[PDB]
């Protein structure tokens, strides 16, 4: 099961030992799994609504809100645990020569278990509060490469 850490992982505020049944109640009540819509036209993946993973940093089932800048890029590294490096490609204008030069920036981003990603895939990241020393973004959508 998802219980792989030394502590017992559970969603805060969801009581799993209630005598009554959660049938016919909203998410997060009656022991039902909690999930939410982040707005901005993004859809909640089915893997997050019907999943069993616990991730307090998940934008859909965690305790993090999306607000600020929405960015897009390509997955550059997917070797960390629930974190990826997103490469953003842009052109920098050189004024004196009236021409452009290719530049890039690596933006660390948290990816919830509901998303499947591989190097080269296109991802959309929404800004959130600092999650680590360098992570300030959360993956919101993944488009497989060649699709």
């Amino acid at each position: 099961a998802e219980q792989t850490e030394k502590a017992f992982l559970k969603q805060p505020g969801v009581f799993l030992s209630s005598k009554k049944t959660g049938k016919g109640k909203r998410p997060g009540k009656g022991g039902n799994r909690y999930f939410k819509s982040i707005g901005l036209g993004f859809k909640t993946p089915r893997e997050a609504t019907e999943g069993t993973y616990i991730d307090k940093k998940c934008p859909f089932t965690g305790n993090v809100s999306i607000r600020g800048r929405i960015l897009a890029g390509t997955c550059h590294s997917a070797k960390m645990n629930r974190t990826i490096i997103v490469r953003r490609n842009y052109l920098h204008y050189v004024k004196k020569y009236q021409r452009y030069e290719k530049r890039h920036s690596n933006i660390p981003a948290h990816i919830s278990p509901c998303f499947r990603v591989k190097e080269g895939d296109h991802v959309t990241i929404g800004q959130c509060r600092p999650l680590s020393k360098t992570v300030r973004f959360n993956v919101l959508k993944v488009i497989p490469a060649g699709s």
Partner: peptide, 12 residues
């Protein structure tokens, strides 16, 4: 503690 949370810790 109760439910599966109790089971998890008592096993430890």
């Amino acid at each position: 503690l109760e439910g599966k949370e109790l089971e998890f810790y008592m096993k430890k």
